[PDB]
Design a protein around this ligand. Structure first.
Ligand SMILES: Nc1ncnc2c1ncn2[C@@H]1O[C@H](COP(=O)(O)OP(=O)(O)OP(=O)(O)O)[C@@H](O)[C@H]1O
Ligand SMILES: Nc1ncnc2c1ncn2[C@@H]1O[C@H](COP(=O)(O)OP(=O)(O)OP(=O)(O)O)[C@@H](O)[C@H]1O
Ligand SMILES: Nc1ncnc2c1ncn2[C@@H]1O[C@H](COP(=O)(O)OP(=O)(O)OP(=O)(O)O)[C@@H](O)[C@H]1O
Ligand SMILES: Nc1ncnc2c1ncn2[C@@H]1O[C@H](COP(=O)(O)OP(=O)(O)OP(=O)(O)O)[C@@H](O)[C@H]1O
Ligand SMILES: Nc1ncnc2c1ncn2[C@@H]1O[C@H](COP(=O)(O)OP(=O)(O)OP(=O)(O)O)[C@@H](O)[C@H]1O
Ligand SMILES: Nc1ncnc2c1ncn2[C@@H]1O[C@H](COP(=O)(O)OP(=O)(O)O)[C@@H](O)[C@H]1O
Ligand SMILES: [Mg+2]
Lengths: 247, 52, 247, 247, 247, 247, 246
């Protein structure tokens, strides 16, 4: 359904296919608009646990003082307020896949809390006196260079090796000059049919402008520009001036 | 760290659950009647048996 | 009710009328006191969500330690003192419009929390174990140029790309010489009835003066000046002397 | 109780009389001991809110991390400690006047947290899902040149025009030579009546001295000097010798 | 009681007697060890609030975050961790006298918290909506020149004119050559009974050395030297050899 | 099965055999991925109490507010919500082995409590009355330089002396070159059965490459590289080119 | 505790002489010499023998909560103050407070410390009542306190207040006569603690103890002796086992 016309994207797809029989946690590194969520969901679908639940978590939205409670759960009576026992996110992803997005936004105090769950997967609930054994497949996505953060002191050295078993780097859309055109057409079919418009193609000058225009926002910026062009179009095609003011 | 902060916390609270209907034992009959008169004044649904 | 006489604002009005069927996020930039919230409300009225609540939220005053809790909701037993269930703004405004005022005041730590709720509309409540999706229209208003802040590094680039699907820029009142007289007349007619003032028009010298003041406060300053003139008015016509505060 | 013998004071009083029916917020600027509180309370008394409660609050007296709680109140379950629903100071002065004392010292962050409340009167409590509408006339007092602080970047320009509908300037007492003699006589009479002193006026040399010193605390410094003289007075008439602290 | 021999001490005592009938706040300036607290206690005894409690506080140790919490108290829901209401220092000193040691060292930011309480006497607690009126006499002692701090942009002039109504100056021991022998004899007699050394007086050389020395620590340093001499002597009279701690 | 083909490793193993029968706390300091958990479990296995439970816990996995409620336990009625009393982890390891992962993350109060428990030998419940006695063998493993922590003040010196009676330092894998080859061949076969990938071993060039790479994760990085090679290889011999890209 | 050197005997006699002295006592020297031992001896030999000996090190005290440990707080005073806490002065009411390594304290904290000592009265952070206590102050210093004062990193008034009686303990580097008794005492104590038959060190190994400069002094000596006991397999300890540690 997506577009993987670039040979580098074909290599990444082949690497995704080659880890169908694997279960070690996977790390994804790249810029914005590259398809980290797309790669994670493709790996999940090609994995044998595709039918299993897939839980995606952003580590920046969990409150600081309840970090242990959410990811580990608690029994009734553990603290004032624990009137009913709850199951954590990890046990929700027991037998499935857990995808951590924006994992570089994790405070150093919260990073050391995940050393043993990644390796062994065994943890004790808040107020739980019996060990819990689970099977979790871990995927992580980051928008910054993890090696630089490790060498700089903003990221734990142990956590990078725990998570960095298989590293995938998504190239920017700028290097993927052969993917802009196949995407730009597809987004058109995503927009006009949703808006009941009469645009069925792009002019050669518009295509050349899109090729020359640098996509810092990559696929997201391309989609935004194409959607704006479709919104403010008038005719059966998109001329140069319809998108020149934007890109 | 010293500071007045608004936050979500998971703490343990003791059991101070007391000090209700306990002050009605130390009072005499006269002061108890005075308290009952105050309660009757403040509550329209409370009435006391009379003879008139 | 409102007045739109300047030819440049006519293009903005036409763009608003051309996105009546759209539901994508909208970002608005402009100087202080130009009417960004008025433009946002005008866009809301013309939208298909006109019969839906228009939840306007100030993100510059939300406490940080409960910020997520104030935008995601919480369950019973999530933390001490949470003896009842409650929601956030996203669930309370489902199917409507959420308008964030002064989006630039947000700190970097808070800007990393909505990255998975602006696009897919999904999140998790504090202590909840069930995924929830909402369909809301996201609008934002700001005064500082977001692009230059991203270049400097005081705002998230990916969040800017996500929010900046359609950008509307309001020019300063000094560039708009075709609305100063109509807005002054509208303010005079509005304030001549609240205080039963006999003022019925302006003087030619006063009108000439109105065309010279830079209008630092723009529409708000013009409204305040008209109110001061009405309150301190003796004759039926406002002479240039009563407008000497603009000299 | 209040002496207004200087022509500027009479002009200020007449302007106050003209704005008795005016409900817009007012900002007062002056020096230390000029009478900002007295003028503000006179404005409040002459307005329609004469019998309405007058809530005078200092912004710097509130801690930073509970500023929003003290400003808007909170609902049950908002935080660890939100035992019951509580109203804010704005809801405390419903229908009356709110007096922001020493508004100049307010930090930039706090000035961005009250931009929607002043102009519209609508704000949501912490944990409350219902909108609160309040009607309070705002009088702010400052000893700083806010019109220069907005240029210097130490004050937010957005709030300046929200508090800049009406601006009052109180000239220093050293320019108010028509007030020095009457204020000195009134203070001497009051301090003789309170302290059971048998003094009933100044001497001509003392009067000349009182009209030549460059007072810096203005009326408050004059009151302090008069009280100091009355305490150490030893005769029915006060001479220049008692007022040796001037020059 | 307290021994005063020098003419300056007699004049200070007479001025205290004269102004004891006054309820004005007092500001005392001197050095470290000059006996400002003793003078303040004498003032408290000689006033009409001698039977009333006297609360003396060293404001150089109060944390900044709990400054308002200690001064104004708080209610049940003021912040996190509080369960019961607490009184303020002003309320604890209501109907009495409040003394502030080393007011010069106070931070410039926190000086705004005492601008209105001293004059108006009305303030609100943290988390409360009720105004509280007291009757407290403010005494402040400092070893630094307040006026110099005001001139160099370190002190708030409004607070100065609030407290700078009654001024007291205590010269150091270097100008108290007459008042050295009585203090030395009093301290020797006290410490002789304290440590059971039974030492009666001093010899000629010891008295000459004590009188000739320009004490910098003043009465405190003299008392410490006397205590050390008592601890390290076995004779009936202390000679210069036992006073080797001096220069 | 574990491989130890290094003379330093053999000496460390003999030390493990000698000390495994002792009754003193053990402190394990080493680099990342050296086998601290492996060493601790080897100590537990080669002991008279090998049948006893091995309670391995992480000091960063315990919330502070329930630390005394987790490592020690609590009784019924000592706090609100306490339906039933629950034992602590300390009583769980009675007569066995308690392992503390990353001991350097403990707070000052937590370290003080741990020192109290270790010195006394008997502890108390959270709200109990009787005293509980245990016979635990305490092991703790950390990677931080404890000397820097004690010099800065993040670890109690007396606690370090008590726990650090014996210091076990696993040499870095860069100093264990002679042991590098047997380890990888242990993984290469193990993954070959695990992932059904047919492989016989490495070549001369690959072995020379492995002995030249400056490993930082020690065992963990080597294992990750071997697993990557097994996944991304179909041939029976791993060549230099296959491992060169990973390096 | 064992003291056999003439310097140690003089130290013990001086400590017994200052037993009747109630003034605060300062002790200085090198690391691992027995400043805490000497302070405890002073505590036992004085009239305050039954009173607690509250000994703490000022190195681990956090900067921002120093006052929280100086006076104490009540319930609800601040975030994290679930209950009330008592400062070391309140805990040592009538006892002896021993501040170890006082020379490393920050300057601003020191100015807030002795002020409590001289007046003797203090307020809890959150308490409305003034607290009056009586304490005896013992201080320990690891560096040259006079040199620190001359460098502007200390207070002269605090030095004078704690300098009423000052003690210097020579380190183990100049106490070779105690080396054999201390080694024998530690050897016997560890042998009886770990229940292993060890008699004593041989003649060959006795040279290494005197050859060792003993930078760590008695702490390092005890650690080395315990480690040698743990790895010992016979009733006699040779020079080989000590060689691996030295
Ligand atoms: N090959 C592709 N074909 C079609 N659409 C794509 C492709 N790659 C990415 N997209 C689109 O890019 C959009 C932006 O999401 P994307 O997966 O790129 O996230 P991102 O910017 O890398 O970061 P985040 O993990 O925070 O979502 C998605 O809605 C997806 O539809
Ligand atoms: N075309 C118009 N006709 C009449 N009034 C207008 C018009 N445009 C703007 N205004 C007035 O301008 C005033 C100031 O606008 P607005 O409140 O949006 O300013 P702001 O300070 O930039 O806002 P914000 O609260 O988002 O910071 C509004 O109260 C509105 O009544
Ligand atoms: N006309 C007047 N007649 C009598 N007293 C006056 C007059 N004007 C000012 N005062 C005196 O001035 C003193 C200070 O007044 P006020 O409280 O307004 O000062 P301020 O420094 O301007 O106030 P704030 O800083 O609190 O806004 C009062 O004690 C008041 O009695
Ligand atoms: N002798 C060995 N033979 C085989 N594998 C070994 C050996 N020693 C260690 N390992 C491997 O080392 C891996 C990591 O070791 P361990 O669990 O002790 O980590 P660690 O050093 O405590 O980690 P961290 O310091 O990062 O928390 C284990 O999964 C184990 O397979
Ligand atoms: N004469 C001795 N006999 C036996 N053990 C001794 C002797 N002197 C010192 N020790 C040992 O030295 C160790 C450290 O003692 P102590 O803490 O008193 O010294 P310190 O490190 O110099 O003091 P401080 O850190 O308090 O300034 C203790 O374990 C004690 O048993
Ligand atoms: N008239 C006096 N008689 C006896 N002692 C005095 C007298 N005046 C001052 N002192 C002594 O001087 C000391 C000064 O203490 P204090 O006033 O607290 O500090 P400062 O003088 O720095 O303000 C007191 O301890 C007191 O004993
Ligand atoms: Mg480990």
């Amino acid at each position: 359904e997506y577009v993987f016309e670039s040979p580098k994207m074909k290599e990444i797809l082949e690497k995704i296919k080659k880890i169908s029989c694997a279960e070690c946690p996977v790390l994804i590194t790249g810029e914005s608009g590259v398809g980290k969520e797309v790669v994670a969901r493709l790996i999940h679908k090609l994995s044998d646990r595709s039918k299993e639940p897939f839980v995606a978590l952003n580590v920046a939205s969990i409150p600081r003082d309840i970090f242990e409670a959410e990811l580990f759960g608690y029994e009734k009576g553990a603290f004032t307020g624990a009137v009913s026992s709850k199951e954590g996110f990890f046990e929700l992803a027991d037998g499935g896949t857990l995808f951590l997005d924006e994992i570089g936004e994790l405070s150093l105090e919260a990073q050391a809390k995940l050393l043993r769950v990644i390796e062994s997967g065994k943890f004790y609930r808040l107020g739980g006196r019996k060990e819990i054994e689970v099977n979790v497949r871990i995927l992580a996505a980051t928008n910054r260079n993890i090696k630089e953060l490790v060498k700089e002191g903003k990221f734990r050295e142990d956590l990078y090796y725990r998570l960095g078993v298989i590293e995938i780097e998504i190239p920017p859309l700028r290097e993927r000059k052969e993917d802009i055109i196949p995407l730009a057409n597809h987004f058109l079919k995503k927009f006009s049919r949703k808006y009941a418009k009469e645009v069925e193609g792009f002019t050669k000058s518009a295509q050349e402008l899109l090729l020359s225009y640098p996509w810092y926002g990559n696929v997201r910026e391309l989609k935004n520009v194409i959607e704006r062009a479709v919104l403010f179009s008038e005719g059966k095609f998109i001329d140069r001036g319809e998108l020149s003011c934007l890109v | 760290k010293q500071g007045l902060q608004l936050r979500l916390s998971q703490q343990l609270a003791m059991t101070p659950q007391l000090q209700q209907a306990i002050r009605l034992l130390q009072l005499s009959t006269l002061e108890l009647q005075q308290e009952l008169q105050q309660a009757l004044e403040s509550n329209p649904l409370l009435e006391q048996i009379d003879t008139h």
